[PDB]
Write a protein that binds this ligand. Structure first.
Ligand SMILES: *[C@@H]1O[C@H](CO)[C@@H](O)[C@H](O)[C@H]1NC(C)=O
Lengths: 49, 48
Protein backbone atom coordinates (compact mmCIF):
# COMPACT_ATOMS: atom_id res chain seq x y z
CA UNK A 1 0.00 0.00 0.00
CA UNK A 2 2.67 2.61 0.95
CA UNK A 3 6.41 3.24 0.39
CA UNK A 4 7.07 2.98 4.18
CA UNK A 5 5.20 -0.32 4.48
CA UNK A 6 7.61 -1.89 2.00
CA UNK A 7 10.47 -0.73 4.31
CA UNK A 8 8.64 -2.25 7.34
CA UNK A 9 8.19 -5.57 5.48
CA UNK A 10 11.83 -5.65 4.23
CA UNK A 11 13.23 -5.10 7.74
CA UNK A 12 10.53 -7.57 9.05
CA UNK A 13 9.75 -5.00 11.77
CA UNK A 14 6.98 -2.52 12.71
CA UNK A 15 9.55 0.21 13.48
CA UNK A 16 12.07 1.49 10.90
CA UNK A 17 15.07 3.60 12.05
CA UNK A 18 16.47 6.56 10.03
CA UNK A 19 18.31 5.54 6.85
CA UNK A 20 18.02 4.50 3.17
CA UNK A 21 16.73 0.93 2.74
CA UNK A 22 16.64 -0.75 -0.69
CA UNK A 23 13.00 -1.91 -0.62
CA UNK A 24 12.40 -2.92 -4.26
CA UNK A 25 13.13 -2.74 -8.02
CA UNK A 26 11.40 -0.47 -10.63
CA UNK A 27 10.96 -1.88 -14.17
CA UNK A 28 9.07 -0.19 -17.07
CA UNK A 29 6.85 -2.84 -18.73
CA UNK A 30 6.44 -3.39 -22.51
CA UNK A 31 3.63 -1.24 -23.98
CA UNK A 32 2.49 -2.49 -27.45
CA UNK A 33 4.42 -5.35 -29.24
CA UNK A 34 5.65 -5.08 -32.91
CA UNK A 35 6.69 -8.04 -35.14
CA UNK A 36 8.40 -7.11 -38.43
CA UNK A 37 9.55 -9.61 -41.09
CA UNK A 38 10.92 -8.85 -44.63
CA UNK A 39 8.46 -8.13 -47.51
CA UNK A 40 6.34 -11.20 -48.45
CA UNK A 41 7.65 -10.85 -52.06
CA UNK A 42 7.32 -14.12 -54.08
CA UNK A 43 3.94 -15.97 -54.17
CA UNK A 44 4.13 -19.55 -55.69
CA UNK A 45 1.99 -21.22 -58.41
CA UNK A 46 -1.11 -22.59 -56.67
CA UNK A 47 -2.82 -20.07 -59.02
CA UNK A 48 -1.50 -21.95 -62.06
CA UNK A 49 -3.23 -25.08 -60.57
CA UNK B 1 48.12 2.87 -2.09
CA UNK B 2 44.59 1.73 -3.09
CA UNK B 3 41.89 3.19 -0.62
CA UNK B 4 38.54 2.09 -2.24
CA UNK B 5 36.93 0.04 -5.03
CA UNK B 6 33.79 0.29 -7.24
CA UNK B 7 30.51 -0.15 -5.34
CA UNK B 8 28.31 -2.37 -7.50
CA UNK B 9 24.78 -3.76 -7.06
CA UNK B 10 23.31 -6.76 -8.95
CA UNK B 11 19.59 -7.49 -9.45
CA UNK B 12 19.31 -11.21 -8.92
CA UNK B 13 16.04 -11.58 -10.91
CA UNK B 14 17.12 -9.67 -14.02
CA UNK B 15 20.45 -11.53 -14.08
CA UNK B 16 19.18 -15.07 -13.33
CA UNK B 17 15.99 -14.84 -15.46
CA UNK B 18 15.51 -11.55 -17.30
CA UNK B 19 12.15 -10.75 -18.98
CA UNK B 20 10.84 -14.28 -18.09
CA UNK B 21 8.10 -14.29 -15.38
CA UNK B 22 7.95 -18.12 -15.46
CA UNK B 23 11.64 -18.18 -14.37
CA UNK B 24 10.95 -15.70 -11.53
CA UNK B 25 8.22 -18.07 -10.22
CA UNK B 26 10.71 -21.00 -10.25
CA UNK B 27 13.45 -18.89 -8.54
CA UNK B 28 11.45 -18.36 -5.30
CA UNK B 29 11.45 -22.15 -4.64
CA UNK B 30 15.29 -21.76 -4.32
CA UNK B 31 15.28 -19.50 -1.25
CA UNK B 32 16.62 -16.33 0.41
CA UNK B 33 19.88 -16.34 -1.59
CA UNK B 34 18.95 -13.07 -3.27
CA UNK B 35 18.51 -11.39 0.12
CA UNK B 36 21.97 -12.45 1.42
CA UNK B 37 23.66 -11.48 -1.89
CA UNK B 38 22.19 -7.94 -1.67
CA UNK B 39 23.11 -7.74 2.02
CA UNK B 40 26.68 -8.81 1.15
CA UNK B 41 27.11 -6.30 -1.72
CA UNK B 42 25.45 -3.53 0.39
CA UNK B 43 27.96 -4.04 3.22
CA UNK B 44 30.88 -4.00 0.78
CA UNK B 45 29.39 -0.79 -0.66
CA UNK B 46 28.94 1.10 2.69
CA UNK B 47 32.47 0.06 3.77
CA UNK B 48 33.81 1.59 0.54
C1 LIG C 1 -8.51 -16.36 -59.62
O1 LIG C 1 -8.50 -15.08 -60.29
C2 LIG C 1 -9.35 -14.08 -59.71
C3 LIG C 1 -9.16 -12.83 -60.53
O2 LIG C 1 -8.83 -13.12 -61.88
C4 LIG C 1 -9.03 -13.89 -58.23
O3 LIG C 1 -9.97 -13.01 -57.62
C5 LIG C 1 -9.04 -15.22 -57.50
O4 LIG C 1 -8.62 -15.02 -56.16
C6 LIG C 1 -8.09 -16.18 -58.19
N1 LIG C 1 -8.03 -17.45 -57.49
C7 LIG C 1 -6.92 -18.18 -57.45
C8 LIG C 1 -7.00 -19.46 -56.69
O5 LIG C 1 -5.90 -17.83 -58.02
Amino acid sequence: LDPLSETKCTLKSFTVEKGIYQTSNFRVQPTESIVRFPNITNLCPFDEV
Amino acid sequence: LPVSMTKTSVDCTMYICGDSTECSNLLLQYGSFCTQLKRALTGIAVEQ
